[PDB]
Amino acid sequence: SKPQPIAAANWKCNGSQQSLSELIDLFNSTSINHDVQCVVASTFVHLAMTKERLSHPKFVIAAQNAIAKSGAFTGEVSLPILKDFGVNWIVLGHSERRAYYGETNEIVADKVAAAVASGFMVIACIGETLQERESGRTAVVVLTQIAAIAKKLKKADWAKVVIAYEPVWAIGTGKVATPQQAQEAHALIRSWVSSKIGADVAGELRILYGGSVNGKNARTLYQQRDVNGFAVGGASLKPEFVDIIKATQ
Amino acid sequence: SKPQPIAAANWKCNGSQQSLSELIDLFNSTSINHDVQCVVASTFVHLAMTKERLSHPKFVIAAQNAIAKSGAFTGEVSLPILKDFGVNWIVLGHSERRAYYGETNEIVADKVAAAVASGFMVIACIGETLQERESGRTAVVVLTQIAAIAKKLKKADWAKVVIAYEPVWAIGTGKVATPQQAQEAHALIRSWVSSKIGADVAGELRILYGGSVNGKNARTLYQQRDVNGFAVGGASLKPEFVDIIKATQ
Ligand code: NA
Ligand code: NA
């Protein structure tokens, strides 16, 4: 049987205090009847209002990035600062940070290891671009990324690690990957974890899919065997995110 | 004579909820006689707490970084989000962001221009490192940095602009800067503004010294003709930042 599903909401760099408050009101009054870990990743600025406002028992607050240690790094937020603030979940290694802000496979890995060592629950983001897919390099690309992450981690650290496979071609483009495209990618990841890390770990590991998911395609995507939830971006700002949660059985 | 001095506290990626609150409480209980604009620049996480705790009427709050627009930029904060959050000041182009996070002269200039257009008071940071100073390109680097910013600004926009000069060569590198060296860099900046933008702008332009400043040398540093205040790093986390404020006469 699949492990506990996860419906992660990546608001990215969006939202006002009022528009996010109205979105938080919907989540609080949302009745969820199955076991699923819902995750709301807001900006650093909106973390305080989200902590006080969102009170749903199946929801947790997360950050979208962090650096390992505190110090003379103007503009950045560290893991001890987030931990002092009461934030225990975090999204790390998003393709936008991998592309825009120079986060390599090794920088992402060292951030994951530091967060797990700080007690964080980490959603590590991997995935291939469109040029890597049409060149037939989705396999080497995706696994190269997770291999760097696993290298900096021990076996017991995977209980704090969640993998979110997001193909860059599907992120914010409206071109969702078909259930076969998602299942073939998640199965390729899970078998690597079973071979290198362990079979018990690969069974415990949660592989989420992200990329233009909405209320209409979520149910059919989750029916695949190796899909343990969703990382939602554009639809996480809209009332249909409730439907994405319910689509996790 | 001199325009309104500025005492800006750059806490960088530092602080806990308890430690920063005690520091804010000490700031709030401090009697400041003369006219001076005090600025507290915390991490995004602590902006909400600083917004409630800080009550001293001569104090405002600032961000340490931002991107121009909101959108699909996981982990970053944008200017409209900060403006919606009640943040009216911002520090941009800090040397640590120019070195670690790919902020070039053009990228810095684009953020400053977008910040002014969004209603922000901008503390724009410039300065040269030791290698650039030992190789004798202080005037080359410093003037190139401010020219990149100026070519994206109109004459009226300089009312919202504050320049911070960072002597990167004299911050924790064993080299002790003298007040005469700070004055020379400040006079270099202002005279260029006077001939390139206008003498009226240069007369009102606040040029802040962003070196290693303590409450002792801050008096002699501020006595220089073209020093209009300080952009403090390490001492800004300490109660002696108050002494740096009072050193602005
Ligand atoms: Na006042
Ligand atoms: Na002015």
Side-chain angles (χ1 to χ4, degrees), chain A residues 1-51 53-68 70-127 129-130 133-136 138-153 155-174 176-179 181-183 185-195 198-215 217-218 220-245 247-249, chain B residues 1-32 34-130 132-153 155-174 176-179 181-215 217-218 220-222 224 226-245 247-249:
Chain A
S1 64
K2 302 180 186 182
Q4 179 200 39
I6 295 181
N10 183 15
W11 292 350
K12 299 183 180 184
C13 190
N14 299 280
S16 62
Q17 315 186 225
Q18 200 167 59
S19 71
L20 295 183
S21 276
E22 303 182 10
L23 185 58
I24 283 178
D25 269 340
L26 170 56
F27 297 163
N28 294 330
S29 58
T30 292
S31 294
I32 309 176
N33 296 322
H34 73 283
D35 182 26
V36 51
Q37 178 62 258
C38 305
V39 178
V40 174
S42 68
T43 68
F44 303 119
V45 169
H46 303 136
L47 286 179
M49 67 150 295
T50 307
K51 282 174 48 187
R53 269 236 42 192
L54 209 79
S55 56
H56 198 283
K58 292 186 177 63
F59 272 84
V60 295
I61 300 97
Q64 300 176 14
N65 184 37
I67 62 174
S70 303
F73 310 104
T74 298
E76 301 291 319
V77 180
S78 68
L79 299 166
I81 288 180
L82 288 174
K83 187 194 201 194
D84 173 83
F85 203 65
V87 178
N88 310 275
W89 284 72
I90 187 175
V91 175
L92 291 175
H94 193 279
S95 62
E96 295 162 358
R97 301 211 64 85
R98 294 178 173 268
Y100 301 148
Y101 317 114
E103 294 200 353
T104 60
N105 296 331
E106 287 66 38
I107 294 179
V108 173
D110 297 21
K111 287 186 174 186
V112 169
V116 175
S118 302
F120 280 86
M121 289 290 303
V122 178
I123 300 180
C125 301
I126 61 178
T129 195
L130 176 63
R133 171 82 135 192
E134 294 180 342
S135 65
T138 310
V140 50
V141 156
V142 153
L143 204 156
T144 298
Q145 300 150 178
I146 193 177
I149 297 180
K151 173 182 176 179
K152 304 293 170 56
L153 296 172
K155 222 199 74 185
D157 301 338
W158 281 91
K160 308 309 206 69
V161 172
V162 172
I163 299 300
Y165 164 74
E166 308 193 291
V168 194
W169 72 78
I171 296 181
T173 60
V176 196
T178 68
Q181 290 179 336
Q183 171 64 27
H186 291 205
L188 171 63
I189 297 170
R190 191 177 307 270
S191 159
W192 181 85
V193 178
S194 185
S195 173
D200 47 15
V201 172
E204 179 191 53
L205 175 60
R206 268 92 60 93
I207 310 181
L208 324 177
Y209 169 78
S212 303
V213 308
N214 53 33
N217 52 31
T220 85
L221 280 172
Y222 186 80
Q223 296 304 320
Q224 297 300 323
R225 148 162 268 109
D226 298 283
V227 178
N228 300 121
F230 298 107
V232 190
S236 70
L237 292 179
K238 288 145 131 157
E240 58 181 296
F241 180 75
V242 170
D243 303 290
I244 309 181
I245 303 180
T248 57
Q249 293 329 111
Chain B
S1 55
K2 281 187 174 183
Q4 181 198 31
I6 299 187
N10 182 15
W11 289 346
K12 299 189 177 188
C13 184
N14 300 283
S16 66
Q17 297 179 248
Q18 184 64 38
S19 69
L20 297 179
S21 299
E22 299 170 356
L23 188 61
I24 292 183
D25 290 338
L26 183 137
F27 293 165
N28 288 332
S29 67
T30 297
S31 298
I32 304 176
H34 63 290
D35 180 27
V36 56
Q37 182 55 250
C38 301
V39 184
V40 173
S42 68
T43 74
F44 305 116
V45 175
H46 305 126
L47 285 174
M49 184 204 68
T50 307
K51 205 169 62 179
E52 300 299 328
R53 210 50 194 206
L54 192 60
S55 64
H56 197 294
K58 298 186 174 180
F59 275 76
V60 297
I61 314 178
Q64 296 176 19
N65 187 41
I67 54 176
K69 293 171 56 62
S70 296
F73 312 103
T74 292
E76 300 286 327
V77 182
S78 63
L79 304 163
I81 292 178
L82 291 169
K83 191 69 178 180
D84 177 87
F85 203 69
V87 182
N88 302 320
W89 286 66
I90 186 173
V91 182
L92 292 171
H94 192 279
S95 55
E96 296 158 1
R97 302 212 61 85
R98 295 174 174 264
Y100 300 150
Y101 315 115
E103 297 208 358
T104 65
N105 293 329
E106 303 83 58
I107 293 176
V108 167
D110 291 321
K111 294 184 173 186
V112 171
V116 177
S118 301
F120 283 86
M121 295 288 300
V122 187
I123 297 179
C125 300
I126 61 182
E128 81 286 353
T129 64
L130 310 91
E132 302 174 311
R133 174 151 277 238
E134 287 187 13
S135 58
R137 273 199 298 144
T138 292
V140 174
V141 170
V142 167
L143 293 186
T144 306
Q145 290 166 330
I146 193 176
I149 300 172
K151 69 184 66 166
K152 292 309 216 295
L153 298 180
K155 174 166 162 51
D157 299 334
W158 285 88
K160 310 288 185 173
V161 171
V162 176
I163 300 295
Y165 170 73
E166 291 183 291
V168 194
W169 48 277
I171 301 180
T173 75
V176 180
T178 64
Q181 291 165 310
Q183 165 64 23
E184 172 177 54
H186 284 228
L188 165 67
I189 296 166
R190 196 181 310 277
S191 57
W192 181 91
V193 173
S194 173
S195 297
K196 195 60 184 176
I197 319 297
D200 46 4
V201 169
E204 294 172 56
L205 179 59
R206 274 87 63 101
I207 307 179
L208 307 188
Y209 177 74
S212 58
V213 179
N214 49 312
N217 74 333
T220 64
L221 279 172
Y222 184 80
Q224 295 301 319
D226 293 278
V227 172
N228 303 119
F230 305 99
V232 183
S236 66
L237 296 161
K238 300 180 175 180
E240 77 155 330
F241 178 76
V242 157
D243 299 334
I244 302 180
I245 298 173
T248 61
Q249 313 306 132

